[model samples]
Target: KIEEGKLVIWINGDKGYNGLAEVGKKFEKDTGIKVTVEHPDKLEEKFPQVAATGDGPDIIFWAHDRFGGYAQSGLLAEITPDKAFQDKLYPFTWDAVRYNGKLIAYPIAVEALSLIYNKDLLPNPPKTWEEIPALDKELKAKGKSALMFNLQEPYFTWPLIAADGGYAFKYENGKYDIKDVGVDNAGAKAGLTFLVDLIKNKHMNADTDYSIAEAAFNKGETAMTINGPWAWSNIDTSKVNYGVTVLPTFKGQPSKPFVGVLSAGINAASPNKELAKEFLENYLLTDEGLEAVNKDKPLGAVALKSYEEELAKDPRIAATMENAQKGEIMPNIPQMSAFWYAVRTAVINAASGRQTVDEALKDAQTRITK
Candidate 1:
């Protein structure tokens, strides 16, 4: 039986909880329903375990990436928004919440990688990957790195990997074909080679990890790096005097970063599912609700076209939105776990000189398929 007059939601991050808390108060005032927004630890790991047991919050707010597993496991109820509501958000935002042709969550905010550069070091940001080496040479002479990114991080490397039409999975008609793995294709191998060559040629450091690259960017030792709006916390844009722009093209082809959408979904087992849906459809997904949520910590990019004027005022967010528009929505299937692991292992093998790009990706394909 459903609990009366009470709704509980699991969320993470202080800004997320605080923002929803503000909306929760209004929801209580308007509907006379108490809303408890709980920020739990290890949400991504705990949600599936608890939700599967018929005991968890009525709703959960998190990234769309994990919902594929949750929805496939019958933890999330399909979310169908009315046409009027759908019209309010950008069209591309909706796809990330879909799994196996079913919509399971409401897209809250979007993010994608963009080239972030310090203006004092490079007044004109390179527009193409080919332009990087010349700048790399100049920076090399000065004992500085032209770029610094996690060498083995597939998330950071996706833009280059997909530059010539490579992808982990084929996404079409609003659904991902998980059976069709494309990561080992020729284009992808070329892209992977580009990455390894950057290390071989000394344009990037093979030792770079997330924090190392972040520290270099923070210390202004690296001129440019690919990152999203979420990186602002560590990047300290206020102190860096930098600009955010689309990733540089590769051989006349645009580099497409992976777009990630944060979302809210109703737990299927919750007796209060209907109310949870209403809370999302009528309250949290609205302009007023999102504006409140975005007031603090800042959303990576707003899904609503209503934020156009506001987005322009914030140059970084606007640039990220531009990149998101050009980027591909990351595949959010249960099988994505395999893709992540295989690619990381392969990238490391290839980047470390233990295997050729083709050899590494071919092995990755086997691992992904098997």
Candidate 2:
């Protein structure tokens, strides 16, 4: 009973296997639409090649960070659904999927960053960055470090910078202006300085790997770590009393980690455009679909109103949601790729004490602009 003119969808094998597969099965069962989902190992390479031949999947799941490039290259379709459908989504969720003036994707899940701590070690988590250093000092004096940070990971650092009022690029008149891209901005510099001091003063260790950090925290080797919801399944919560909270603020402004939305988008040249849209509208946006999505991946849901109530009942989810409210979704601009790599290099060099903070930032500015 295979249906003709079925839609083909491509998803990332390593990252979103569960969510995408479940959606495919549900979509097929509800609509009698034969949906073939391909979990490609090399999606980054495979997508562009398929797009080039105009034979790509009718729908795809991708991160917002890649939208700028895809939009610039004309690889995605412009999704200008009517205002009624658009208004139902959260403001941040909608904005995260927009590139330029065109809507490019439909959001599915929201990923927010937060600080995770062992309640057995520190009953109360620090609420400000100023408290972090002293707390670390106190912990180390007792022969233990309070926190673990991936000094080499920009994903962990950029949020700290943003909490201090720094930005990767300035938006003016609806477009990005590179003239303002610099880590030397006052807020960014302060953020970097704090990180350098923490590492140099031995307040935190630069272990950098998620596996090591999760293991150490589980064994009670360290007190707290900065991470996202994705780490929950990996950590053993039974042995240690654990709690999660928003990242501490700098000068009253909380750390704003880049929020990422997992979304589905239709390919521009797909032959099943109308049917695909029907699938997204009726099958994917239904109550049953939302329930399936939340069930298949228990971290966070895309449904805003219900999500808040769910967060209220679960402390872990509430902490993450609070942090997410403070977050600015990662810019969907293509130039962001260049910005991320350059800034990461600068942060690593500065934190390792190889280059002065000012010098590292200056080099990063030059590299990003080049």
The list of candidate 2 runs beyond 4 A from truth reads 1-16, 30-58, 137-144, 236-239, 272-275, 299-313
> Candidate 2 residues 1-370, lDDT tens each?
1223788877664343565567768777876777786877657557767786776788877767877777788878887677787766777777888887778888766777789898887999988888888887787777766888566668788878877777877877877787777467788888888888888887765546656676778778788988766566555444677888879888888898877787778777787778888877666666555655545444454645544454456777778778878887677887877887888888888877889888998888888777
Q: Per-prediction TM-score, please?
A: 0.84, 0.83
| Candidate 1's TM-score | 0.84
In model 2, state the lDDT of residue 85.
78
Q: Once all C-alphas are superposed, what RMSD does model 1 give against the true structure?
A: 3.3
Candidate 2, TM-score vs. the true structure? Answer: 0.83
Model 1: per-residue Cα lDDT over 1-370, one tens digit each = 2445489888765335777889888988988888998888778778888887877788887767778888889988887778898988878778778787789988888878889998888888999998788898998798777898776568888888889877888877756677788889988988888888988887876678877888887898999988766667556644887888889988788998878788888878777777787788788777788777766556777777776446657878878877877777777888876888898898888888889999999999899888
